[PDB]
Design a protein around this ligand. Sequence first.
Ligand SMILES: [Mg+2]
Ligand SMILES: [Mg+2]
Lengths: 296, 296, 296, 296
Amino acid sequence: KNIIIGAMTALITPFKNGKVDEQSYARLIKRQIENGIDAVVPVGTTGESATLTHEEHRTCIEIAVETCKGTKVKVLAGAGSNATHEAVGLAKFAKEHGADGILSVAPYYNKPTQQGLYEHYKAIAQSVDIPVLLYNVPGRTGCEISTDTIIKLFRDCENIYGVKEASGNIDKCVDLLAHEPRMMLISGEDAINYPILSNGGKGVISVTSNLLPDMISALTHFALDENYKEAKKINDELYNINKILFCESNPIPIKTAMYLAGLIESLEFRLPLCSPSKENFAKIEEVMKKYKIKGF
Amino acid sequence: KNIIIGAMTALITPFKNGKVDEQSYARLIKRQIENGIDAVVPVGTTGESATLTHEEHRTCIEIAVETCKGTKVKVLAGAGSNATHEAVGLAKFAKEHGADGILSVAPYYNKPTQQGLYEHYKAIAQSVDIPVLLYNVPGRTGCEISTDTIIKLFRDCENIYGVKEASGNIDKCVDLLAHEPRMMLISGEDAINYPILSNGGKGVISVTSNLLPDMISALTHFALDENYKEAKKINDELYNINKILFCESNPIPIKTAMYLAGLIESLEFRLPLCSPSKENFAKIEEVMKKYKIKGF
Amino acid sequence: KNIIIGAMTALITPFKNGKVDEQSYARLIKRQIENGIDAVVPVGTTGESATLTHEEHRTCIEIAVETCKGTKVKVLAGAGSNATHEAVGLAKFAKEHGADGILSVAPYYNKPTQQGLYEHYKAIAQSVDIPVLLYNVPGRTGCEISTDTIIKLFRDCENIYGVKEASGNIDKCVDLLAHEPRMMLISGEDAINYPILSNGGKGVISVTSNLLPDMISALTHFALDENYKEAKKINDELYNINKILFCESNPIPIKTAMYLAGLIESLEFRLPLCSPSKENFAKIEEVMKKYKIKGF
Amino acid sequence: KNIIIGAMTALITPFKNGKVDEQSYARLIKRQIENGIDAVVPVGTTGESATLTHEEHRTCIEIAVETCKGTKVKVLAGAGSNATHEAVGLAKFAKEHGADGILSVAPYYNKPTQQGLYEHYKAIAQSVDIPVLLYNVPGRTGCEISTDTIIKLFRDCENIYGVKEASGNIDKCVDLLAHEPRMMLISGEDAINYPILSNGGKGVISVTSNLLPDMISALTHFALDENYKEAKKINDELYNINKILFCESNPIPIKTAMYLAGLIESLEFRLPLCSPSKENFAKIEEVMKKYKIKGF
Ligand SMILES: [Mg+2]
Ligand SMILES: [Mg+2]
């Protein structure tokens, strides 16, 4: 199987006057490259995929593909939907724009069954010949991809190589890698990055890395080189910022943090997302001062 | 306030050869009309809104509007999205073909805050001047519209007149009606239709009514006439079918039941939704034979 | 079946200098009788059963039995345990001390299976010849008595006549009374007292009634007389006090309220229970402001 | 600080004709000793503490203390209660009988507040001068000891040295050891033994070790030697039996497994505990066939 692993960032999408700040989007991708990030994830959950146009969707994949060209950095483009046929289209259209692989979230809202999840992802995997990483986040989608379906999809479709897990369930990550140790388990939860890596996980798709890419990069590579002492210490050091980046719904805190560090120009979201409360604004701000933030 | 209340049906969308069976859609809406239904809800969750194209969206709202012209039955069109920009368009689009009001689901997947939910629905309500009913289903959206947000939207925007509750939280339904008794609480959960109505609820948007429109209509009208003994008696009789219609995700069981009753032509869904397992097929069929299913 | 229904109070156990204030216990029971209460529950969860000794247990049952002599009030004494041999013993000794019936909590901590719960309660029911009311409170016991187990126990032993439901699950209360309408469903959750009664429940075992016995008495009796309008109106009115009486774990807030109203002399608990935070203390005092508390 | 860490077993309590099989109890404890276990836990949750008398409570501590004399193995006796006055008494009662330390479960059923939990454990710690290990299992107790309360108790009372976590929350296990790395995190959940140990946990209190003590000992000692690959491989091999030992509530499956392996005499529990169904009997019987079960 062809895989995309290592330290990866779920890129935020900066807005300027209600439109995508394309120059800041690319400058932020270059900040990730120069800090040891192995892949960038355009238009993921942290990138506000839900409120971007299909043409803004296309614009930020191209920026990501172009900025990492000539580098070892891959583009795992967000290309998922709760309609399988739309998800198939977005997968084929992400490939046509140079993405090295796709992150495809479990169908949200309409709660498909395990049989439906299998056929949904099976249809996507047969749509393109580039790696496909599953994305399980039941707290946001309202459904769960069971361990059996993940393993079945991994074994039955050749380009499906792993799962991004955001479930706060270390038992499931033991279940997954004990029955199928060949899959690529990816942490989708910054606070528990190290435990997932220490059990055989092979990468991270991080929110914190938007603000602290060097620290997330060091964490993952220490772990992949089995230096768990150094990996655990950065994971322990990052716990406060890892939790405070979820005082409100992602990506509200991380975008607030990037604005407070001066890495984006305006703290703009697209509704129904909005700026945080003024206590969480202040309580994000008080935590950032104990972490050291690299510039451009 | 302008309102749409009473016994309402979240219409299934029958598919035949992968397209919307327009004749059966009309046929079914007239079947609802002739069994005491007060309003129909096209392209709700039970109508597989997520997998229909906008043009399909338009066809079933128009079919519903035309089938109920000249009758008492109202059309509460599904018009919601996890992007406000999109939800405003779908609301206007709905008004545009004669829908009497819109049911607008809480933004799914992207988990807006209470502040974002307020601005989301405030933007929708000021976009149209037809009634807007909120739709809270945290198990599917991953978010909850708090009682404070519901009540504020009810008081701050004149066309927002109530909420369709599908949260299995009778505590919230006393909380809602105790602090704002002028709002229209609508049950989106068939098993507890009577308890919600007995506490002052003014209607249901039902899945079961697709199969047993006469029984659900009678239940609601029994309750609205304060004949709670007869309203509770219909509710108790319906518990078995009300629960078995959720052995798998809605609308998989109800469409199976409609197909087994000979009310639609093929048991077709759009992925990621699919046919049920063979015992839930058997378990839907073995509970269906205990009820009297009205024909055309 | 012999039954104990109507408005019932889970009596708090007042402490003074680490001892049970037997005279203040008798004065709270008298105040319950004179405000329309149909039965009192000594040494329930609200009575701090876990921290009372066996004479205390016996002292408050005898005081309750003697204080309600010459009145219609009945005594449903708490006599349960997560060890079946102790639960049987406490049941037999509750009968020997003049209790009209027993409230038996679902075994806590050790999570018995449905088969174990059946045999547990079957041994209790065969140990005494007084009515037995089951008590399901999964948030505190860690286990749930399923509807089938409750219904099986109701049908197999004459003295098991119903269940005190404290699960915030109006669906389960439809499940129970739809399949076995001869059982006595009793509300163990003040905020949803009216919905449980409106669905055929025949009484409450209340926490708020300690502070506002007349209002809980009026609510319960209005419902049993099918004056649902009046019953919901007291329910809606008490919603604020019903919820804040659980800002901390029961009976911490209710004892704070009784102390703030001057109905007990000292705000004492037995560890691990203690008095609440001073913000919740201040916050309990602020909801009491709109209620009229009866004296002695 | 004095600590009790390493591979530890939550001993089952065998019954024959309704009473504790004292001769088999000693023969199971030495079987644990001869397979590399570092400490045994008499009358814990797996030992059916709730249904043992205080004379069997004293009988099973003395056998454990006496059977491990002249050996390395320590005795961490279960001595807890939801009444602080009983927990203090049982702690002094465990020390006087030769226990090397006490495991004290969070108060069950009566849901103490965080401040009440603090004073509860603070009172216990001053009663004895032997190590105290906190025991958090919210699914059984109905309460959670927060990270702040655990860290406060560890720092304020000299003999409180760590916690036995059974909450399936690896995030909490990062939270605990990142803010207080001197505490002893002990796994109370066999399936996630390795992830908890790899994050700095220093031992397990296991259910599976009753049946496979050598494998749990090797797992813990491989991990404590920072040979995490061999620890992860034993953890992965054990996942199936670790899960099947919870098909029903512990200790129903482990005692069934011990009975099927011929290590105990009778499949007897004390009510409300009971024998499992014939599924779970068959599913325990079929998962055991992949492991090698050491004899006497
Ligand atoms: Mg997220
Ligand atoms: Mg346990």
